[PDB]
Design a protein around this ligand. Structure first.
Ligand SMILES: CCCCCCCC/C=C/CCCCCCCC(=O)OC[C@@H](O)COP(=O)(O)O
Lengths: 218, 56, 293, 339
């Protein structure tokens, strides 16, 4: 036992360091950034602040982490479960692609991805923050081409106010866990620089609701 | 995708020319090797906790 | 100086309480009601405890406090069951020590129930106001508060059993508890009222904080559900204890007040409090009801 | 025209290989093993549990010393335990908290890790003057790193979801060799005792035997109906086993070049995460998603034991080089040793 106790001392030091790291980490939000092939996720990253990109920032004394894995290009069914427990999933969609094509419409692929993500067996209780980028571009584009190209069932005026709400309701309808999770929608505003405030409010609401759920209050 | 097809055929070609042996001989050799080293497996024959380094 | 050699007859005659010589109709009525309430309490709380201990999901501090409350309610039911078959004519054959024990059981059981309610409120406040995301507790504070609850209950129950009795203060004796003193009644009532005030304050602060921090994202409303839950939790306590709690005050302050009229129904209601507790704190959790089968 | 006739020739060659395998199938291992007596119920108890991780455990690996083992977790730490005394020796902080594999060098001088970052981090445990520092960072893979095994102190075999494997050189940092042929994500690999060959299992419901020296595929084995999550070598070197998500293990033999044995139970329907063999090959331990691990009999294909001490999915399972114990790690942040 000449040195065996130094091993225990080193183990105790390592344990207290691990406890400190866990304490420091538990006060950081986790936002998994998802989106289709082409969207404004880069614009969102720029506004807020090879395999995986991590962007850290702080707002009103609250820390936030955002993970981008768009460069994986592999089977999503294998690594998605690694993100179980994240505070929220920030999904991005560009409206301007309602008329474009990939073969098949890009909006339909985005809707399929949203259905696969929201209704996944790992993201049942994780909330989703939906972003609908390219607001002005879509407002200028809809004047020429109607939304009937993507959604034929649409019956309304070719106007931004109505078509945007139609797309929002169509994206929200895909949700099936209507009681375990909530979806937050916000049309990105480039001038205002308010995209961090909305994320902060949504994360605060999510944290408060999860706290209430932990106890019997909700 | 002609290059892929040619590569796949070339790969499958070498698979056929292998020293295949009847299943009976392989099973016999497997059983022999498995029963020869049975004495050295602790998991197979539970070892007393006195000698086991992990028991006590 | 004081009279430890006297019988229960003297203590009951010094006050206005009467000894029944046979099973009166009201005696059988209260006996049946109490037996039913006791079996219901026991069954419900045993079900709650087994459900909490069986499932792996219910292994968190809030569920531990709920299980402790269920155990306290089971103990209160056992105490009220023992009280039955020892009241009415049976009480004419009871001695001093047995009477003190019979009353201390009820006292400590109800005190433990109240303390468990307060601890649940405090834990909910902590869990809600922890602005930190998770900050998971070490899970040792729950055991500390549980043992403190049980120790405080045992103390409140045993103090009148040994030393704080009106046996040696004969003039300053109650009317419903001829052996106990009015000071102990006042102390218990003050403790109950303070616990209720603290609970109300905590829940109101919780509601206000939640409303303030959720109004921004408001536009299954959270406000309505939270308000309903808090209102039910507080109204149960109110309707169960206020009529019985004011009776001790009437006895200590108002002489000639006919306090002996509704003591038994008020005790039945105070026990119905524990009978209804497991439903209030376990009906909202869908998983809890699902585990039942 | 050329593509059509090439496809037809490929299908004819596959049919010829099927016919050759059938001809080689003179009997079944079940019949030859019917005479030998059963081993009996194999009961093992948790002899030591290890704590310290604040998140799920995704991979572990034993060392040649049979004493120290490495484990990874989502919390961003890589820990090195001491099973004999459950004493934490090293706890390396990772640059990225997303890791899905581990490895302990045969000489005990280096360790490896990797995952979603697509970079294989090689750490040296010398610590000449200070804390453990990243010795090297191998890059070049276009997908998540699923497994990595130290072929030597200078070489290492890696597998990624990019449908290919690689053999690197720590000193150079470049892909010394590349192995292609798979159509799906390679989820696991296992090295042979002599390090002259290895096997890779992908999500294409097939396994492939690769020669490190030459760089081509020796044999391709099929029969599964889902992704192969794990693969282990038989101690002899002429056979291996594969576990998939279809609730079924399969033992293949190289010299026979066909499916030798199958292990499946109607009572079990969940997927499989890891598989391992005992020092003698009698027992084929397999971890499942049902929070338990089911011991098998390589020759008789009958269950002989169940390990159930984890509260969540069992992610990693390993057997020591000595065979005296078995390590299991689950998503509950706790490791356990058996026997
Ligand atoms: C009156 C009930 C108000 C609610 C009080 C709940 C008890 C909590 C403990 C309080 C300490 C002081 C309690 C004094 C009153 C207790 C009266 C009682 O519980 O005895 C029942 C009474 O019939 C016995 O009748 P007999 O069997 O015929 O003597």
């Amino acid at each position: 036992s000449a040195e065996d106790k130094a091993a225990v001392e080193r183990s105790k030091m390592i344990d207290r360091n691990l406890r400190e790291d866990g304490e420091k980490a538990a006060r950081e939000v986790k936002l998994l950034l998802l989106g289709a092939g082409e969207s404004g996720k880069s614009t969102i990253v720029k506004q807020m602040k090879t395999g995986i990109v991590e962007t850290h920032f702080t707002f009103k004394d609250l820390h936030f982490k955002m993970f981008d894995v768009g460069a994986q290009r592999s089977e999503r069914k294998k690594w998605i479960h690694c993100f179980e427990g994240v505070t929220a999933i920030i999904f991005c969609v560009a409206l301007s692609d309602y008329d474009l094509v990939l073969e098949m419409n890009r909006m339909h692929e985005s809707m399929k991805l949203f259905d696969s993500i929201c209704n996944n067996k790992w993201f049942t209780d994780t909330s989703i923050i939906l972003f609908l980028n390219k607001k002005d571009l879509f407002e200028e584009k809809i004047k020429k081409s109607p939304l009937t190209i993507c959604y034929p069932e649409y019956a309304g005026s070719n106007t931004y106010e109505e078509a945007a709400a139609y797309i929002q309701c169509q994206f929200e309808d895909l949700n099936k866990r209507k009681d375990t999770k909530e979806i937050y929608t916000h049309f990105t505003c480039a001038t205002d620089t308010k995209n961090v405030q909305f994320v902060f409010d949504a994360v605060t609401d999510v944290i408060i609701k999860n706290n209430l759920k932990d106890c019997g209050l909700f | 995708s002609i290059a892929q097809a040619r590569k796949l055929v070339e790969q499958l070609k070498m698979e056929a020319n292998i020293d295949r042996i009847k299943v009976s001989k392989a099973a016999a050799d497997l059983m022999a090797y498995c029963e020869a080293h049975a004495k050295e497996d602790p998991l197979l024959t539970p070892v007393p906790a006195s000698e086991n380094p992990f028991r006590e | 100086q004081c009279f430890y050699n006297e019988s229960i007859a003297f203590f009951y005659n010094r006050s206005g309480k009467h000894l029944a010589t046979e099973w009166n109709t009201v005696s059988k009525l209260v006996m049946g009601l109490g037996i039913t309430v006791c079996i219901f309490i026991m069954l419900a709380n045993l079900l709650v405890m087994v459900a909490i201990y069986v499932n792996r999901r219910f292994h968190f501090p809030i569920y531990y406090l709920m299980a402790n409350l269920a155990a306290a309610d089971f103990f209160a039911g056992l105490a009220y069951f023992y009280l039955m078959f020892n009241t009415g004519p049976n009480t004419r054959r009871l001695t001093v020590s047995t009477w003190l024990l019979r009353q201390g059981l009820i006292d400590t059981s109800l005190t433990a129930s109240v303390a468990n309610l307060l601890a649940i409120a405090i834990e909910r406040h902590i869990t809600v106001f922890r602005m930190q995301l998770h900050t998971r507790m070490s899970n040792r504070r729950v055991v500390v508060v549980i043992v403190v609850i049980w120790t405080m209950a045992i103390v409140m129950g045993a103090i009148p059993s040994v030393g704080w009795n009106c046996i040696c203060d004969i003039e300053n004796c109650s009317n419903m508890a001829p052996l106990y003193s009015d000071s102990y009644l006042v102390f218990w009532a003050i403790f109950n009222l303070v616990t209720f005030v603290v609970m109300v304050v905590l829940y109101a602060h919780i509601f206000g904080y939640v409303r303030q921090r959720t109004m921004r994202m408001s536009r299954r409303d959270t406000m309505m559900s939270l308000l309903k839950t808090v209102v039910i939790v507080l109204g149960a306590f109110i309707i169960c204890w206020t009529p019985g709690l004011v009776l001790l005050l009437l006895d200590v302050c108002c002489p000639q007040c006919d306090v002996l009229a509704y003591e038994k129904f008020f005790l039945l209601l105070a026990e119905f409090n524990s009978a209804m507790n497991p439903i209030i704190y376990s009906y909202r959790d869908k998983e809890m009801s699902a585990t039942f089968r | 025209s050329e593509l059509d006739q090439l496809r037809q020739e490929a299908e004819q060659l596959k049919n010829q290989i099927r016919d050759a395998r059938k001809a080689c199938a003179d009997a079944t291992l079940s019949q030859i093993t019917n005479n030998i007596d059963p081993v009996g119920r194999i009961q093992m108890r948790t002899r030591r549990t290890l704590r310290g991780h604040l998140a799920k455990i995704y991979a572990m690996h034993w060392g040649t010393d049979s004493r120290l083992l490495v484990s990874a977790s989502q919390d961003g730490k890589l820990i090195i335990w001491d099973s004999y005394t459950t004493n934490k020796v090293h706890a390396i902080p990772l640059r990225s908290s997303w890791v899905m594999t581990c490895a302990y060098a045969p000489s005990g001088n280096y360790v490896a890790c990797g995952g979603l970052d697509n970079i294989c981090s090689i750490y040296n445990l010398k610590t000449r003057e200070g804390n453990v520092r990243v010795s090297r960072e191998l890059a070049g893979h276009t997908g998540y790193l699923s497994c990595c095994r130290f072929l030597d102190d200078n070489q290492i075999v890696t597998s990624s979801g990019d449908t290919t494997c690689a053999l690197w050189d720590i000193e150079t940092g470049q892909q010394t060799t590349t192995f292609t042929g798979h159509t799906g994500d390679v989820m696991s690999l296992s090295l042979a005792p002599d390090t002259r060959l290895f096997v890779s299992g992908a999500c294409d419901a097939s396994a492939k035997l690769w020669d490190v020296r030459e760089g081509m595929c020796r044999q391709t084995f099929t029969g599964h109906e889902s992704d192969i999550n794990a693969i282990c070598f038989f101690p002899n070197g002429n056979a291996f086993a594969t576990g998939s998500d279809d609730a079924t293990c399969r033992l293949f033999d190289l010299r026979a070049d066909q499916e030798l044995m199958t292990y499946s139970h109607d009572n079990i329907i969940c997927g499989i995460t890891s598989v391992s063999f005992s020092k003698s090959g009698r027992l084929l331990l397999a971890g499942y998603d049902d929070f338990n691990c089911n011991v098998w009999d390589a020759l008789k294909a009958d269950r002989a034991g169940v390990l159930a001490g984890h509260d969540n999915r069992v992610s990693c399972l390993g057997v020591t080089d000595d065979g005296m114990a078995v390590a299991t790690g689950s998503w509950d942040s706790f490791l356990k040793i058996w026997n």
